[PDB]
Amino acid sequence: GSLVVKSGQSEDRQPVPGQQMTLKIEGDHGARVVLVAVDKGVFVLNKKNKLTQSKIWDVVEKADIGCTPGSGKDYAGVFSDAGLTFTSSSGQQTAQRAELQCPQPAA
Amino acid sequence: TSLPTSNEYQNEKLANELKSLLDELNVNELATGSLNTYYKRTIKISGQKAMYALKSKDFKKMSEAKYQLQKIYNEIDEALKSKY
Helix, strand or coil, X not given: CCCEEEXXXXXXXXXXXXXXXXXXXXXXXXXXXXXXXXXXXXXXXXXXXXXXHHHHXXXXXXXXXXXXXXXXXXXXXXXXXXXXXXECCCCCECCCCCCCCCXXXXX | CCCCCHHHHXXXXXXXXXXXXHHCHHHHHHXXXXXXXXXXXXXXXXXXXXXXXXXXXXXXXXXXXXXXXXHHHHHHHHHHHHHC
């Protein structure tokens, strides 16, 4: 989707402590939003483990069952490297795989 | 009689404006009693500024205190309406 947080006011820069201000949140209709406002000094002490959208996609890619940027040794290796199983009535079928992880490169 | 001169009438108009807000000052300071501590802090700070400005007759301080006291008054008005 698209969630955006911005100020409602368009002037009165640097508000006063305790002052009322308007927080404006633009986002897809029907979604539930959770908020947290923290002093940046806490992150100057420790900014580790900060969750973000990029690290979310990082965990998704780390759970991928595909192990090759395409191609393969043959038609069976194409599907087996992509993460697919193929089987036909004729007899042609994908290579057997019994491991969740991807084979490790030699490096 | 002769009519008042250039600035005497103007200075009186400003003072009358400040006197008006000061009459309801004790009410507004009281009204913040059930409001958040931000208002209670803000109005008592803005209150003395107007009080000193009136007895000093300083145009600079009387002008600012007027608009300073007017702003916190408007903040209280919105606060009471949204508090219901």
